[PDB]
């Protein structure tokens, strides 16, 4: 046989790692880590989403599974160019994380008539699903 370990990988922080700003003035946009200050804080830049180039504590951002190629210390023109080339914005939008965010804000933006409409549609869908729950 062969040796087996559980690898247990998680989300390294390095240059080119895409992060989501959790709280602050941006608070929900994407950025790319440009360089690492120390153990607790990094220099990021989010030039497509309008995040200014700044040093930020690592507790204020969430690391995403997205990575792309950057040299360390890259200026914002190169950051925007490589971001557009790797095309990570729709790669983020294709994830179920961003779909969950969009679902949450859509449900927040519903009105009372739309809530009545989703109640009627959910009753119709529940009727056909519980009808399907009688043959298997």
């Amino acid at each position: 046989t062969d040796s087996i370990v559980k690898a247990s990988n998680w989300r390294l922080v390095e240059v080119g790692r895409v992060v989501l700003i959790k709280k602050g003035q941006s608070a929900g946009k994407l950025a790319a880590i440009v360089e690492i200050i120390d153990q607790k804080k990094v220099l990021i830049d989010g030039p497509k989403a309008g995040v200014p180039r700044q040093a930020i504590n690592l507790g204020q951002v969430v690391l995403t599974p997205l990575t792309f190629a950057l040299p360390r210390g890259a200026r914002t023109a190169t950051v925007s160019k490589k971001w557009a080339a790797a095309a990570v914005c729709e790669k983020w939008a294709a994830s179920s994380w961003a779909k969950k965010i969009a679902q949450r804000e859509r449900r927040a933006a519903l009105t009372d008539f739309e809530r009545f409409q989703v109640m009627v549609l959910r009753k119709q869908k529940r009727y056909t699903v519980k009808k399907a729950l009688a043959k298997a």
């Binding site: 859509r106 449900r107 739309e114 549609l121 869908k125 056909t128 699903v129 729950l133």
Partner: protein
């Protein structure tokens, strides 16, 4: 938000859980705490045994019967830590404390109900990895609790029955998820997806 909140005491810190729960009772929420033998106290087992022996020394000199009572069960240790944080000598404190019952294990009124956790009192979220902690059941059976093994046997039986429940629940939810996926991509499904559901 709930009539009764059932808290699984496993992996929780005693003081932080007690300060959450005492404020919940004083605000008027009914709390029942199950699995009190699996609470955690930060620090070495020898430190907390020495702390309990220092507490156990204290008694009224002329009559030990009217002194401080040193209760030995883990639930009563938790009750002591919580009665310290409720002003129990007033009518408001008594009315708060009668909204609480704490148990070792999960009794049959509550084994079929839903258990919650308190994330600001959980040991894995509060302590630094590397700090040493204790188990309240081990400390309590070291200082004189007699029923550590019967609770373990009852908990083993309850876990067997609960796994038998969960297998059927998982099979049913896989059937329901399959039917929901096959009944998706219809017109009502796309309208609900446009409207956010």
């Amino acid at each position: 938000v709930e009539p009764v909140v059932v808290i699984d005491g496993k992996g929780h810190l005693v003081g932080r859980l007690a300060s959450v729960v005492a404020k919940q009772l004083l605000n008027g929420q009914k709390i029942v705490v199950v699995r009190a033998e699996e609470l955690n106290i930060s620090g070495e087992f020898f430190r907390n045994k020495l702390k309990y022996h220092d507490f156990l020394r204290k008694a009224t000199a002329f009559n030990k019967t009217r002194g401080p009572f040193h209760f030995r069960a883990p639930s009563r240790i938790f009750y002591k830590a919580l009665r310290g944080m409720v002003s129990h000598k007033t009518a408001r404190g008594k009315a708060a404390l009668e909204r609480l019952k704490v148990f070792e294990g999960i009794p049959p009124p509550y084994d079929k109900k839903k258990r919650v956790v308190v994330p600001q009192a959980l040991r894995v979220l509060r302590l630094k990895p590397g700090r040493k902690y204790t188990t309240l059941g081990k400390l309590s059976t070291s200082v004189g609790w007699k029923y550590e093994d019967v609770v373990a046997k009852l908990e083993a039986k309850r876990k067997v029955s609960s796994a038998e429940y969960y297998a059927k629940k998982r099979a049913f939810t896989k059937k329901v998820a399959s039917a929901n996926a096959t009944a998706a991509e219809s017109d009502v499904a796309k309208q609900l997806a446009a409207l956010g559901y």
